[PDB]
């Protein structure tokens, strides 16, 4: 049984929360933090994030694409 990874992602982002700092790197290693998923976690999760950005779930802040720091939309 695989737990829902995206829910984990939201929890991790909230866990790795800051109102100034937003850089993805921090959240990413946060995922590296605590435990670890299957070797292809980075690719598949990362694509999930990317696609939910495309849906407008979250709003860009710094950088472009998954290299940046980002904030929620209003």
């Amino acid at each position: 049984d695989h737990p829902k990874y995206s829910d984990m992602i939201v929890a991790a982002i909230q866990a790795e929360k800051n109102r100034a700092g937003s850089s993805r790197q921090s959240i990413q290693k946060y995922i590296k933090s605590h435990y670890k998923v299957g070797e292809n976690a980075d690719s598949q999760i990362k694509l999930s994030i990317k696609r939910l950005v495309t849906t407008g779930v979250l709003k860009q802040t710094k950088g472009v694409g998954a290299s940046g720091s980002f904030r929620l939309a209003k």
Partner: protein, 873 residues
């Protein structure tokens, strides 16, 4: 004997000796290995074993104590506390020897220790050692390595520890720290590990650090540290500086002039690479951090607020020295440019733009002359530095200096963007968009839009390297052409724009242009492939002669693509290829508004044949999991999703696909697929249902099955209903069960997590009943079959349903189920009618409301319920 031998024997050609090993380890996991660990600890402690058998021993022990599964790591912690202390602690005892007696790239005991500690520190099961550790490091007699691998272990522990745990022994740790930080310590490995330990511990330090004195005394030792040749300890230190900089931001005035400034100026002069890598990423952090000072003081003096922390304006005294070197520094280019590397340059650029915003007017006098001097430098690595430096200061400095230059620049720019030197026109165009981007001098061109676009048409056919700043220059141009038609008032988005006369050429030049081999230069590909969904978005196909033929061309491009992706053996290559696909699941979106009712459908069918043979090859690898399905939930809407020709292939691979236990979310998708299916299983669906019967029984029988997928179970039978569906309406009650469980679901909407999707399922069973009642209307099947043998329970079936119906006002979806209940509920039987019937309020609130005009059919239904109501009295 010992397991370490076993690790070597886990790879030993002796079959049985390996199976027996892989046997005690899977039993011992269940058995809990009470001594096993102690014995392993003693051998591991023994420096007489090869590094391999011991690092492997650490991986097994590790795999028996910690894990990449949070839960499994916490259970190994509970499994540990389950193990006897004599043997457990005894294991710890022999484990200490190993520190220094081996080399392990990853410390596994550290990660286990910290993980379990997260379980024993909280209860103080074994927090006593720490002070002993403190004495162990405040008095050193252990060889270098013994203390070294041990400090690396402490680092990992500080990392893997539950942040709320090494507090109890923080004081003792700080003692250990003080004796361990003196400048005298020699080994750069142990020192580095100590800095990295600091790094891992930086989360919860606050009380020790809430004293200016200690942090500064540290700063002191760190300064003694800044001249040592080994790079690694320095890096770990600048990293610490960054985090200490971010959380508890403190003054570097003491060390900036004394050590940060002099060091930096020579490093700048230092031709060596030391300056280039170790000192520049951190440098970008400090420069912007300082920018925080020139803007905090240049607003504090503008806000009449005295900052608790005060700026120094080193930057104002240094802007001038700084402007000429960085600008001269932009010359070491790389002809073939792939945008995936990180280097001092990017950090510098961010600081330049970020700092530039912070930067004062001194830089402009320092950049304008530089712009003039290289904007036409004959070189390419040089010519860029002038223009680039100019484009970076278009928004940072205040508009008084910036707006005039753009004004007189604009007349020159149009001719410049047409300068023989193609580079001048390339960088010129990107820059112009950078101007309207950073200054607001110009918004539209009338005698240049066409001429410029005449130049741009010709620009369409050059080298990628020249084209990457062109895709965005084009984007901004689209931004401009929107302000030559918008005017003051406007109709819906205009169907026709003048280029449409030559636009067809645009659309016919893009596919070839976008598919060139020399893609590695300047990161050209992405910037083109994106603007496409936008230019497609920013295109009109109402006439659509090109969308058709061009579409078949698109297939041809697709086919072209689907051949390197038929054999993608590299994750990056496959991932890279899904870029264009993603872009396709947006260009099709930008064409699909018009079905066109003929050719579009035929084209999809041809393409579908194309989409599916690869699907006929997408099985077992997880490929094309959702990129095509998204499209599918839109293709059915084109012709009502009849699918007369299709679904023949669908029967076995999904029939085994409904047999595959592993699919969960995969099957989730097939559900919205099945949603689109409700309009296509018109005939001869009866036999391949016994199949559905085992699969449906297995998934439905298991509770795990998604709560949402209750209506879809029956709602996709209507298409089967056209021909070859034969079950009668004995399923009506179970739908009277679902709307009965969503009420039963005590979904406390205290938080915004359950609601964001919630009012979707209602629309499911709603569409279900709607289709049922529409196609067929019946109160009940054989009255109620369960009452026949669930009667005693049927009492309550009507009393808690009576409580379900207790509410005077209900949601429309619940109400719809209730109205049917009013009818067949009076048709079922009269038992317990008087008591259950006299159950709830709003009866007069409803009777009055009923006599009100324009009431629908539902009001009439209630009155009938009065025939059977006049069946008891």
């Amino acid at each position: 004997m010992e397991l370490i031998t076993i690790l070597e024997k886990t790879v030993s050609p002796d079959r049985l000796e390996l199976e027996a090993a892989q046997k005690f380890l899977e039993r011992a996991a269940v058995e809990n290995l009470p001594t096993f660990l102690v014995e392993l600890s003693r051998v591991l402690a023994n420096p007489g074993n090869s590094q391999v058998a011991r690092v492997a021993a650490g991986l097994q022990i590790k795999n028996s104590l910690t894990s990449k599964d949070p839960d499994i790591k916490a259970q190994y912690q509970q499994r540990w506390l389950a193990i006897d202390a004599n043997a457990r602690r005894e294991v710890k005892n022999y484990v200490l020897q190993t520190l220094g007696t081996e080399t392990y790239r990853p410390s596994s005991a550290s990660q286990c220790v910290a993980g379990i500690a997260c379980a024993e520190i909280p209860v103080n099961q074994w927090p006593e050692l720490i002070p002993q550790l403190v004495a162990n490091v405040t008095n050193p007699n252990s060889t270098e390595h013994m203390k070294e691998s041990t400090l690396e272990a402490i680092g990992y522990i500080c990392q893997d520890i539950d942040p709320e745990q090494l507090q109890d022994k923080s004081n003792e740790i700080l003692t250990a720290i003080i004796q361990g930080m003196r400048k005298e310590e020699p080994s750069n490995n142990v020192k580095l590990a100590a800095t990295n330990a600091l790094l891992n511990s930086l989360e919860f330090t606050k009380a020790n650090f809430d004293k200016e004195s200690e942090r500064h005394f540290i700063m002191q030792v760190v300064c003694e540290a800044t001249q040592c040749p080994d790079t690694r300890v320095r890096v770990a230190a600048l990293q610490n500086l960054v985090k200490i900089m971010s959380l508890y931001y403190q003054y570097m005035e003491t060390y900036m002039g004394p050590a940060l400034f002099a060091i930096t100026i020579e490093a700048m002069k230092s031709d060596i690479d030391e300056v280039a890598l170790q000192g520049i990423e951190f440098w970008s952090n400090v420069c912007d951090e300082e920018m925080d000072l020139a803007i905090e003081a240049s607003e504090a003096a503008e806000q009449g607020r005295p900052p608790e922390h005060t700026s120094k304006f080193y930057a104002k005294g240094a802007l001038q020295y700084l402007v000429p070197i960085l600008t001269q520094t932009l010359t070491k280019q790389d002809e073939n440019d792939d945008d995936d590397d990180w280097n001092p340059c990017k950090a510098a650029g961010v600081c330049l733009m970020l700092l530039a915003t912070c930067c004062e007017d001194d830089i402009v006098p320092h950049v304008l002359p530089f712009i003039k001097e290289h904007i036409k430098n004959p070189d390419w690595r040089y010519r860029d530095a002038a223009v680039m430096a100019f484009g970076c200061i278009l928004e940072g400095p205040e508009p008084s200096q910036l707006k005039p230059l753009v004004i007189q620049a604009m007349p020159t720019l149009i001719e410049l963007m047409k300068d023989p030197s193609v580079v001048v026109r390339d960088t010129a165009a990107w820059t112009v968009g950078r101007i309207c981007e950073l200054l607001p001098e110009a918004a539209i061109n009338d005698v240049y839009l066409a001429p410029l676009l005449q130049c741009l048409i010709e620009g369409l056919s050059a080298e990628p390297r020249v084209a990457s700043n062109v895709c965005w220059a084009f984007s901004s141009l689209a931004e401009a052409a929107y302000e030559a038609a918008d005017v003051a008032d406007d109709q819906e988005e205009p169907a026709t724009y003048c280029l449409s006369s030559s636009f067809e050429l645009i659309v016919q030049k893009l596919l070839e242009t976008t598919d060139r081999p020399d893609g590695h230069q300047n990161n050209l590909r992405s910037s083109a492939y994106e603007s496409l969904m936008e230019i497609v978005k920013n295109s009109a196909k109402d006439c659509y002669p090109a969308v058709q033929k061009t579409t078949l061309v698109i297939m041809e491009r697709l086919q072209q693509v689907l051949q390197m992706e038929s054999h993608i053996q590299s994750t990056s290559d496959r991932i890279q290829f899904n870029d264009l696909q993603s872009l396709l699941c947006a260009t099709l979106q930008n064409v699909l508004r018009k079905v066109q009712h003929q050719d579009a459908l035929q084209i999809s069918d041809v393409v579908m044949a194309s989409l599916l043979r690869m699907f006929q090859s997408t099985a077992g690898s997880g490929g094309v999991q959702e990129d095509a399905l998204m499209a599918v939930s839109t293709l059915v809407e084109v012709l009502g999703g009849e699918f007369l020709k299709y679904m023949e292939a669908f029967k076995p691979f999904l029939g085994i696909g409904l047999k595959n236990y592993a699919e969960y979310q995969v099957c989730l998708a097939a559900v919205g697929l099945v949603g689109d299916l409700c309009r296509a299983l018109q005939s001869n669906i009866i036999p391949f249902c016994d199949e559905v019967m085992q699969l449906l029984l297995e998934n439905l029988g298991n509770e795990n099955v998604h709560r949402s997928v209750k209506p879809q179970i029956l709602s996709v039978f209507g298409d089967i209903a056209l021909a070859i569906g034969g079950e009668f309406k004995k399923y009506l009650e179970v739908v009277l069960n679902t709307l009965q469980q969503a009420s039963q679901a005590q979904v406390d909407k205290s938080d915004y997590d359950m609601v964001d999707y919630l009012n979707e399922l209602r629309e499911s069973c709603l569409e279900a009943y709607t289709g049922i009642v529409q196609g067929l209307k019946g109160d009940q099947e054989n009255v109620h079959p369960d009452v026949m043998l669930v009667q005693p329970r049927v009492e309550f079936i009507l009393s808690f349903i009576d409580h379900i119906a207790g509410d005077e006002d209900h949601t429309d979806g619940v109400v719809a189920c209730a109205a049917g209940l009013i009818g067949d509920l009076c048709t079922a039987f009269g038992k317990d009618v008087l008591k259950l019937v006299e159950a709830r309020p709003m009866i007069h609130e409803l009777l009055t409301e009923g006599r009100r005009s324009k009431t629908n059919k539902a009001k009439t239904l209630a009155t009938w319920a009065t025939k059977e109501l006049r069946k008891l009295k």
